[PDB]
């Protein structure tokens, strides 16, 4: 199956997402940090990252920039509803797509499926 990594600081949301994507057939890894992310990757093959850019003490747009500088991994950002700026900046950093909170899961899974089709 395709390997998805969810980068999500908030434990409830972490579980909700991992649960939903596991239920849809994916190999899912979770991490709360960009260090966690950098670790799963150097150490495992990852097809797509769902990256919540509201990471306390961390810059998720610069994490995006770094990822795309190094690899063609799929990147879908999770942004807040007060984040218009982050949308365009996030795409400029190299994200393939973004979705906003609150997270509409049915639509997110279709975006993930379509991007994975492009990736593989």
Sites of contact with a second copy (CB under 8 A)? 72, 87-88, 91-92, 94-97, 104, 106-107, 110-111, 114-115, 118-119
Q: How far is the CB of 88 from a second copy (least distance, A)?
A: 5
Between 7 and 108, CB nearer to a second copy: 108
Per DSSP, 100 falls in state E
Between 3 and 111, CB nearer to a second copy: 111
Beta-strand runs (E) in the chain? 3-7, 27-31, 48-52, 74-79, 97-100
Dist. CA 96–CA 31, nearest whole Å: 20
Dist. CA 78–CA 8, nearest whole Å: 9
Secondary structure element (H or E) that encloses residue 45, with its range: none
Between 35 and 110, CB nearer to a second copy: 110
Q: How far is the CB of 94 from a second copy (least distance, A)?
A: 7
Between 36 and 94, CB nearer to a second copy: 94
């Amino acid at each position: 199956p395709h390997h998805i990594v969810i980068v999500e600081d908030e434990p409830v949301t972490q579980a909700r997402l991992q649960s939903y994507f596991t239920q849809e057939g994916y190999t899912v890894s979770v991490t709360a940090s960009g260090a966690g992310l950098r670790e799963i990757m150097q150490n495992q093959s990852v097809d797509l990252i769902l990256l919540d850019i509201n990471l306390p003490d961390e810059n998720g747009l610069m994490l995006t920039r770094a990822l795309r500088e190094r690899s063609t991994v799929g990147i879908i950002l999770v942004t807040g509803r007060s984040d218009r700026i982050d949308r365009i900046v996030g795409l400029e950093m190299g994200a393939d797509d973004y979705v906003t909170k609150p997270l509409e899961l049915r639509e997110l899974v279709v975006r993930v499926k379509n991007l994975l089709w492009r990736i593989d």
